[PDB]
Amino acid sequence: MLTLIQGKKIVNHLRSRLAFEYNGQLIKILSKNIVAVGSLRREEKMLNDVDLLIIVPEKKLLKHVLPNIRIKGLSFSVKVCGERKCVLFIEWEKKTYQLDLFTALAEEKPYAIFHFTGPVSYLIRIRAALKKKNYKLNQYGLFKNQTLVPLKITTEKELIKELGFTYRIPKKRL
Ligand SMILES: Nc1nc2c(ncn2[C@H]2C[C@H](O)[C@@H](COP(=O)(O)OP(=O)(O)OP(=O)(O)O)O2)c(=O)[nH]1
């Protein structure tokens, strides 16, 4: 559906034109809080939908995006996915596209990004490996023998290094 260029230009527009309403007050939202994730990050020729990870330093402000969310001069629709995932649709220039958005906290920054960074297969492999190491990775933190422990990283590299693994390129899978 979307191409590398399309994704780049639409995301750029999307991020600089996003605004949500909280308590009747309009709060504009840029890429400062939202990071484009998908094949776009993997540097792919063509992808289906553009996904956007919205990382907020406050649980409140994060949930404040839900009451009202809009775009400047654009056609959209609001859908939900699972328990923490969200799905939106956007149309412009007589064209229609799919926009997936996930709500995450500033602490769930490295984890979320690592997840959308390359292929799910790699993640599953890591999750299974940690399971053998008696560790459990989750969107909220790392579980050491049922004991939840927070993260001391912010980078994917730092995350893999902290987890005890190596970082490979998603472009060539795993
Ligand atoms: N597609 C999708 N992605 C999710 C989900 N949960 C985590 N992710 C992971 C799976 C993929 O490895 C990675 C990329 O997800 P995206 O939703 O951003 O879409 P992307 O553009 O990468 O794939 P696409 O071109 O939209 O089909 O994110 C999910 O339930 N569905």
The CATH number covering residue 43 comes to 3.30.460.10
- List all residues whose CB is within 6 A of at least one atom of ligand 1: 37-39, 47-49, 51, 100, 115-116, 119-120
Ligand 1 atom, smallest distance to 44 CA = 25
At 152, the amino acid letter reads K
150 & 68 share domain: no
Which residue of 46, 120, 125 sits with most ligand 1 atoms within 8 Å of its CB, as the best mutation to test the pocket? 120
CA neighbours closer than 13 Å in the CB half-sphere of residue 164 = 12
Residue 116 main-chain phi, psi, to 5 deg: -75, -10
> Are the CB atoms for 44 and 92 separated by under 8 Å?
no
- Full residue range of the structural domain in which residue 69 is found: 1-105
Write down the residue that tokens 């899978």 correspond to. Answer: 173
Query: Which of these three, 89, 105, 121, is where a domain ends?
Result: 105
> Are the CB atoms for 98 and 48 separated by under 8 Å?
yes
Ligand 1 atom, smallest distance to 120 CA = 12
At 10, the amino acid letter reads I
Query: Which of these three, 83, 105, 127, is where a domain ends?
Result: 105
Instruction: Tell me the two tokens of residue 21.
Output: 């309403």
56 & 129 share domain: no
Residue 157 main-chain phi, psi, to 5 deg: -65, -50
> Are the CB atoms for 43 and 36 separated by under 8 Å?
no
Supply the CATH number for residue 170's domain. Answer: 3.30.210.10
Which residue of 4, 39, 51 sits with most ligand 1 atoms within 8 Å of its CB, as the best mutation to test the pocket? 51
